[PDB]
Design an enzyme around this catalytic site. Structure first.
Site, PDB file in Angstrom:
ATOM      1  N   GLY A  27      -7.406   2.375   0.081  1.00  0.00           N
ATOM      2  CA  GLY A  27      -6.834   3.643   0.485  1.00  0.00           C
ATOM      3  C   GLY A  27      -5.770   3.445   1.539  1.00  0.00           C
ATOM      4  CB  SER A  28      -2.517   4.189   2.042  1.00  0.00           C
ATOM      5  OG  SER A  28      -2.557   3.020   1.238  1.00  0.00           O
ATOM      6  CB  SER A  30      -3.304   0.989   4.558  1.00  0.00           C
ATOM      7  OG  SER A  30      -2.871  -0.181   5.229  1.00  0.00           O
ATOM      8  CG  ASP A 156     -13.198   7.638   9.195  1.00  0.00           C
ATOM      9  OD1 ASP A 156     -12.913   6.593   9.825  1.00  0.00           O
ATOM     10  OD2 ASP A 156     -12.838   7.842   8.012  1.00  0.00           O
TER      11      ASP A 156
END
Ligand SMILES: CC(=O)N1CCN(c2ccc(-c3nc(NCCc4ccccc4)c4ccc(N)cc4n3)cc2)CC1
Length: 327
Positions: A27-28, A30, A156
């Site tokens: 994913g980016s 990144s 996150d």
């Protein structure tokens, strides 16, 4: 100092220790999946994007590294490695963070026994995070990684669907139980298969929340410092709190009860992570001798206003002082 090797991946050059092999974009900044030759495990390697381009980015880079370096708990993502190709502060421009590669997020991925175990682990991780005076603030299914035997980690540290109403309404002094609100939204969605509060914007979002939980009573109104917020509240047509047993029909009654304790409008009365772990719904998993708290976390830098190169030097310090965890 280890031996690095360079390569181009998508539009970016990646320069990483030979330790990490088989880089494959995910994913980016990144992220690449990689094979960690030291441990035999798969890892995620994140190359930050423009980590020091402005004051705000520089402080954010520092903040993310400090948080990841602090987390040492089975239900919270932790830092396996951090590295830069730079040999000195003067050439320090790129930061790479290495973490466990988790299988899939919960948005991708239920029976009541599965919901029990998943929400138990979220609350266990939150008890730890909250004990450090850290608030996640953005808990949602895509921030919850799960591997194939249902082990979960929080990472996150739409968005609005899981957000506590006091944050929507812009209250400055909200507490850690904004995260418990999010857990309640997540748990409801795992039980029903449907987003609990799929608001189209912030006003619609509050309207959907108030339809379920009811408009604030006088006990809550007398604690609200904003005149505009109090008038907005008292201007809406009073809605009764709905009976959660009616809304989540057929769910385990203990799950309905816990949802009632999480999705309370008044955050002074919302259940905490530590209290929720002791709820009867988690009877088969709860172990008060294996729900640990965190070491204290020094958050004082949040109040500081520094120059780009100062945040950059502090980040460099944290890269150099990193100690890998035991294998
Ligand atoms: C800058 C600006 O424009 N502002 C207007 C809104 N404002 C504001 C908003 C909410 C609160 C507030 N909310 C709670 N919860 C939000 C309740 C609510 C009700 C209906 C719809 C959305 C949220 C509370 C809960 C407990 C407690 N002890 C205190 C609480 N206090 C305080 C100030 C001040 C900032």
């Amino acid at each position: 100092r280890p031996t690095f090797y360079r390569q181009e991946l998508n539009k970016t050059i990646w320069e990483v220790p030979e330790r990490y092999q088989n880089l494959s974009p995910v994913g980016s900044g990144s992220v690449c999946a990689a094979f960690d030759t030291k441990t035999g495990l798969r890892v995620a390697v994140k190359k930050l994007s423009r980590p020091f381009q402005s004051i705000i980015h520089a402080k954010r880079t520092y903040r993310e590294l400090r948080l990841l370096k602090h987390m040492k708990h089975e239900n919270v993502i932790g830092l396996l490695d951090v590295f830069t190709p730079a040999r000195s502060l003067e050439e320090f421009n790129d930061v790479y963070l290495v973490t466990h590669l988790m299988g899939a997020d919960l948005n991708n991925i239920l029976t009541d026994d599965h919901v029990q175990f998943l929400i138990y682990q979220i609350l266990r991780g939150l008890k730890y995070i909250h004990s450090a005076d850290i608030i996640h603030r953005d808990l949602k299914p895509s921030n919850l990684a799960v591997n194939e035997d249902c082990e979960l980690k929080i990472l996150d540290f739409a968005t609005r669907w899981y957000r506590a109403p006091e944050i929507m309404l812009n209250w400055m002094h909200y507490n850690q139980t904004v995260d418990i609100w999010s857990v309640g939204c997540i748990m409801a969605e795992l039980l029903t298969g449907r987003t609990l509060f799929p608001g189209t914007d912030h006003i619609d979002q509050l309207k959907l929340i108030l339809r379920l939980v009811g408009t604030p009573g006088a006990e809550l109104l007398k604690k609200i410092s904003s005149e505009s917020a109090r008038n907005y509240i008292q201007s809406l047509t009073q809605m009764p709190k709905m009976n959660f047993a009616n809304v989540f029909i057929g769910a385990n009654p203990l799950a309905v009860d816990l949802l009632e304790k999480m999705l309370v409008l008044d955050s002074d009365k919302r259940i905490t992570a530590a209290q929720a772990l002791a709820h009867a719904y988690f009877a088969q998993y709860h172990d008060p001798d294996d729900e640990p708290v965190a070491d204290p976390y020094d958050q004082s830098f949040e109040s500081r206003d520094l120059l780009i190169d100062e945040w950059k030097s502090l980040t460099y310090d944290e890269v150099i002082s990193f100690v890998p965890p035991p294998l």
